[PDB]
């Protein structure tokens, strides 16, 4: 939902893990991405595993 | 009780018109109306797809024949419309009122089967993939009831369409039943507000999607305690007299003067002449179902082919149907591939329908066959 | 109560194999099995031949559909198979189980009529004597049920077969009924050990034999105290609207423009034009059943013949059926030629069936007709 609990009222809901199951147990587990919203970056080096 | 939204008939002679001015300016189709009355559905037998039985429920407001009934549930069903894309869809049971008695008990028919009514489809359309038949069947320009969109799982309807008998003109009901048996899926009609926030319309769609895009097979057990009802269905139409007293007309007399030739079908599937048999009876059937067949000699004069006789004495698909109570230890929802264990015997198939009653929650299991 | 022997279905796919090694050395067909269970038949209605009604009985053991039920009686029936030769045949009532309900009440169908099931016979086989038709109908290489042999009276089936309607393809049931009506006989199925002492097999035979080789006609009286159910059956098919409004097409208009010609059938049977009639009504029917017929002019142009119209307006064989209780002063049995006196009127025909119940013993009398 993205409810602002710190400034206002309401119940905050946020997904962190995605569990894929079968009839017996768990088949695969994929965690939710951790978004890092920034304005300006002053970095020396970088290593990317996906894409920019 | 359950909540019910009562709307007047979704007449496509009215709603199919693309005159509605969208907030951006664009001209699109007319959106669904607001319920003329909010009532509560009581004393109900409500099916999910309407595979075998028609729904029946008494309603608080005095509904009439033609009206659309939307039964609401405070739960959500997630359908996988694309490989990764999963959409938040609200649980709905949409029906058309077919008849109301003196005591206001309405006979409800599942929206989809009530939509593809009286529609006939020639063999020419059935020659292509199953997607082409679904795209033909679901059209607001042809159907008795209004349709806005169709959600369909590409993998399940990817295969080549089932071959039609005599290449004749069949009804939309018979072809859908034949297709839904092979694909092991059943349709569910759902009323939901348009995906885009700009579009304020309430729309009706048909569902051919599942919780998993790439459906997986489940293995479960059904105990006798769940009030199990076992009955045998037939998917494919094949003949019932396994033994054939075949007569061939004599050319010289233009009559059936010559004696008949008897043909028996073995347990394996092959068809042989009865005289040619040299066995112990172990490879032959337990009961002899017989019929007398009359054939006319071809222009060439040769007797009719063994293979042509074989098709008429060939066996039909004996399929087991199981109707039982919902097990809370291992819940089974509609459109799930299952392998059911019942009284020491294994039955494989899918969950076709689901009845939401006041007393119980039951499932219709259809054994797809194709065992050896 | 009555004693019952329960065997599994006499499958000809198994028993019609000549692999049984006889004590002398030679090979013969597979003999009948031993009863899987010996039970006692209670609450019964048992028909000797199965002419009109199907038998019903509640059995102690849990029999299933397909099983053969042999009802035993501590008495012997002597059938005359040759002019002088008589065989000591034990009294039997053999049936096939058609359906069993929840309360184990089994619906029994007489073995013969269950054996000649689904069998079709064209006009070509009916052209010969009654012996050829019986030899075709009773054959384990075609029939749904197993049969080893048949004993019959040469004199009763000696005569030429009845002429078929439209010379079409008739079922084994319809032809047998048509033949059994003219010959005044009914078949009985019985299980008996092979005649030769060397052969240890138990065999099933269809009976077309009687206590007298040269059957004699008996003259008796049936009283109102015997609880008589008087009704009417029709042997031959002839049209029921005794008056004909015949229309003939006009050549010039290629239409029915010309007025109709009415044809009346007199009490004697003579068909005349209604206009030509000059009588007092005494020679005409007491009731007028009319019908309107349409005809197309022949290639020559001449109107349709009088005799051809006659066939479409002919009376059918009105035959009286009397079902009555057994008289111990003069007992009557199955296949007996009789002349019955009932309420001052004489009726002539044969004893077609016999019903064995826990309370009474009844007979069905069928008039053969051909009175004037």
Swiss-Prot record, chain A:
Compartmental location: Virion
Top-rank taxon: Viruses
S-S pairs: none
Domain notes: The C-terminus is involved in host receptor binding. Host-recognition domains point upwards, towards the capsid.
Binding partners and assembly: Homotrimer; found as an assembly of 6 homotrimers. Interacts with host phosphopolysaccharides; this allows the virus to bind the external cell wall layer. Interacts with the distal tail protein.
Family assignment from sequence similarity: Belongs to the skunalikevirus receptor binding protein family.
Annotated function: Binds to the host phosphopolysaccharides at the onset of infection. Upon activation by calcium, the receptor binding proteins change their conformation, presenting their binding sites to the host, and a channel opens at the bottom of the baseplate for DNA ejection.
Protein name as annotated: Receptor binding protein
Taxonomic classification: Viruses, Duplodnaviria, Heunggongvirae, Uroviricota, Caudoviricetes
Record gene name: rbp
Full protein stretch here: 108 to 159 of 264
């Amino acid at each position: 939902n993205g409810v602002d609990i710190n400034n206002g009222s309401g119940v905050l809901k946020v997904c962190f893990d995605i569990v894929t199951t079968s009839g017996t147990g768990v088949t695969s587990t994929k965690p939710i991405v951790q978004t890092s919203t920034l304005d300006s970056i002053s970095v020396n080096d970088m290593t990317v595993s996906g894409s920019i | 009780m359950l909540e019910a939204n009562v709307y007047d008939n979704f007449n496509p002679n009215y709603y199919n018109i693309s005159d509605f001015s969208m907030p951006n300016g664009k001209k699109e189709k007319r959106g669904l109306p607001i319920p003329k009355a909010r009532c509560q559905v009581i004393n109900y037998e409500l099916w999910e797809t309407g595979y075998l039985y028609t729904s029946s429920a008494t309603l608080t407001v005095s509904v009439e024949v033609g009206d659309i009934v939307q039964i609401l549930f405070p739960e959500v069903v997630p359908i996988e419309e694309a490989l990764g894309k999963k959409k938040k869809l609200n649980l709905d049971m949409v029906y058309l009122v077919t008849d109301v008695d003196e005591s206001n008990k309405a006979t409800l028919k599942n929206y989809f089967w009530a939509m593809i009514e009286s529609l006939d489809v020639p063999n020419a359309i059935t020659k292509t993939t199953n997607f082409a038949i679904i795209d033909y069947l679901i059209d607001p320009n042809k159907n008795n009831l209004m349709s806005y969109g169709y959600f369909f799982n590409s993998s399940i309807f990817a295969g080549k369409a089932t071959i039609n008998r005599k290449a004749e003109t069949s009804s939309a009901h018979d072809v859908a039943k034949r297709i839904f048996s092979k694909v092991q899926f059943q349709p569910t009609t759902t009323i939901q507000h348009a995906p885009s926030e700009t579009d304020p319309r309430n729309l009706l769609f048909i569902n051919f999607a599942s919780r998993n895009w790439n459906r997986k097979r489940i293995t479960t057990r059904v105990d006798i305690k769940q009030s199990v009802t076992m009955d045998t269905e037939t998917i494919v139409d094949r003949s019932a007299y396994n033994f054939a007293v075949v007569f061939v007309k004599n050319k010289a007399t233009d009559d059936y003067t010559d004696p008949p030739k008897m043909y028996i079908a073995k347990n394996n599937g092959d068809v042989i002449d009865y005289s040619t048999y040299h066995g112990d009876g172990t490879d032959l059937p337990d009961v002899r179902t017989a019929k007398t067949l009359f054939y006319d000699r071809d222009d060439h004069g040769n007797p009719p082919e063994l293979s042509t006789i074989k098709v008429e004495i060939s066996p039909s698909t004996i399929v087991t149907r199981l109707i039982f109570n919902q097990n809370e230890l291992l819940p089974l929802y509609v459109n799930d591939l299952v392998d059911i264990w019942y009284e020491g015997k294994l039955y494989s198939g899918y969950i076709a329908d689901r009845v939401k009653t006041e007393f119980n929650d039951r499932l219709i299991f259809v054994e797809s066959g194709d065992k050896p």
